[PDB]
Structure 1
């Protein structure tokens, strides 16, 4: 956590660099387990060789340690840190829509800067077009004060649309978070459960409303279960307009909301921690259910959940407020 900081950290630099600038998934895989092990590593690495003992540590990575321990730096991370071609891939990739592959191609054609990106809006596709178009807004944080105005409206149409609908703004915002990056609407409905051969309009009806009133401004990807877009607060009685924010809404078969909800309400840790335990408590929890476990090694049999609570009791525990699901 701190005893092996740089090490894991340098490691990750190196790895991320292997995966992005270079399409060397293996080496990339090298650095991660490694960086993962030295990480569990309970003592101060004193040298290459010491580390070298561990699994995942070969000679190359060992080699890197020494030099890092020796000169408080690293040549390659130095060289790399400098290199535009790579500096560039590190950068372009920040536009929603540009992944590494594209990142590379762009550069190749010589598309290094944001401006480059504009002059070639032609080369870009819808996601990435909207991507660049809200480069600023998408990089900003969502003040909770705003989180609440948004939540306010979402719930309102959703409801005006059909009352039978259930919505939940999940994620950090749900867990108190002073700010949030993207908004997460978990959505389900009675009519939609595990079986009932869908009803796409369910997603659809809503997406539209939200657009009609003018909250949803753009579309990144609408699907029959996951619409994914951009929204904005009604720039008041002017002067201060609102930043465009990333919004996401997904339909859920009503018979899987709570787990689902438990889940997206995080955190990553409270989550695992809960999962790791449900296990002890003779169960299993995943993004959608809670099945009683059985001795042949594994079982099934999806227990019926009516609230975050049900899931709780099931593994027999104390309800944990969103506010306090920190870990």
Structure 2
């Protein structure tokens, strides 16, 4: 049934195709999934383990404590790391759905060699202090996992950590801070001024529609400056 399909897609790790396959096999509820662990991959098994926790909102007060821990532990690994918790949290929201950490380091640029250890050492330190409790998926530049505040215990929470080349970092912070409407409005203004902004770069685009090389960006302010917008504090980026 289509209701069952959409329900199953609420488990992280289960997409539409996976949900359709499960329903076809008579697996429709959380209890059904829990009775069929042998049919799940790791991402689905962990997403199921914390299904209830993951649907809870995260109070801002907890997000602050989570941020403070993450930034502190990162600094311990290497003081040259730069890390920013983005999303609606960065805009000052009173609650969050998850924690999205953007990470960079001067040694990692869009021209240097790939450096997955820059990410893995941070994940490992956060595991050592028992902040990160489970992994959903881990690659060379992106970690998707589970974390929990030190304790009555707190709910487990979704955390992503993304390793971004330094020369693309503040475009990433801008993009993942949003809001979606603010990003849309800012991209549109950039176009009026002869620029294209995406998750990675700001580039001039000439009258012939051809894009030039990425422009240097050392801060969010640089991006606002290129398109002649006054800097907007994240809390003022609802639109």
Smaller-chain TM-score bracket: over 0.9
Shift of 1:299: 2.3
Shift of 1:300: 1.2
Shift of 1:297: 2.0
Name stretches of at least 5 consecutive residues in structure 1 with no aligned partner: 1-84
Shift of 1:295: 1.7
Name stretches of at least 5 consecutive residues in structure 2 with no aligned partner: none
CA distance in 2 between counterparts of 1:192 and 1:204 reads 14
TM-score (norm 1): 0.72
Given the alignment of the two structures, is residue 138 of structure 1 paired with residue 54 of structure 2, yes or no? yes
TM-score (norm 2): 0.98
How many residues are treated as equivalent by the alignment? 239
CA distance in 2 between counterparts of 1:215 and 1:225 reads 20
Q: Deviations over 1:94-142 (max 9, x none)?
A: 1111112111221222112211111111111110100110010111111
Q: CA RMSD in A?
A: 0.9
CA distance in 2 between counterparts of 1:290 and 1:108 reads 46
CA distance in 1 between counterparts of 2:115 and 2:21 reads 39
Shift of 1:201: 0.4
Q: Deviations over 1:8-44 (max 9, x none)?
A: xxxxxxxxxxxxxxxxxxxxxxxxxxxxxxxxxxxxx
Q: Which residue of 2 aligns with 1:300?
A: 212
Q: CA distance change for structure 1 residues 299 and 104 in 2, over 3 Å: closer, same or farther?
A: closer
Q: Deviations over 1:230-279 (max 9, x none)?
A: 000011xxxx2010000000001000111111110101111010000111
CA distance in 2 between counterparts of 1:100 and 1:271 reads 27
CA distance in 1 between counterparts of 2:122 and 2:224 reads 31
CA distance in 2 between counterparts of 1:126 and 1:211 reads 18
CA distance in 2 between counterparts of 1:95 and 1:283 reads 39
CA distance in 1 between counterparts of 2:209 and 2:4 reads 49
Q: Which residue of 2 aligns with 1:221?
A: 137
Specify the SS of the correspondent of 2:230. coil
CA distance in 2 between counterparts of 1:121 and 1:314 reads 52
Specify the SS of the correspondent of 2:92. coil
Q: Deviations over 1:131-165 (max 9, x none)?
A: 11001011111100000000000000100000110
CA distance in 2 between counterparts of 1:134 and 1:298 reads 47
Given the alignment of the two structures, is residue 114 of structure 1 paired with residue 30 of structure 2, yes or no? yes
CA distance in 1 between counterparts of 2:15 and 2:229 reads 41
Specify the SS of the correspondent of 1:136. helix
Specify the SS of the correspondent of 2:234. coil
CA distance in 2 between counterparts of 1:297 and 1:128 reads 44
Question: Highest CA radius of gyration, 1 or 2?
Answer: 1
CA distance in 1 between counterparts of 2:5 and 2:77 reads 44
Q: Deviations over 1:274-306 (max 9, x none)?
A: 000111112110001111221222221211011
Higher relative contact order (CA 8 A, sep 6+): 2
Specify the SS of the correspondent of 2:158. strand
Q: Which residue of 2 aligns with 1:251?
A: 163
CA distance in 2 between counterparts of 1:292 and 1:104 reads 44
Given the alignment of the two structures, is residue 318 of structure 1 paired with residue 230 of structure 2, yes or no? yes
Specify the SS of the correspondent of 2:145. strand
Superposition misfits of 4+ residues, deviation over 4 angstroms: none
CA distance in 1 between counterparts of 2:22 and 2:174 reads 40
Shift of 1:90: 2.0
Q: Deviations over 1:154-181 (max 9, x none)?
A: 0001000001100000010000111000
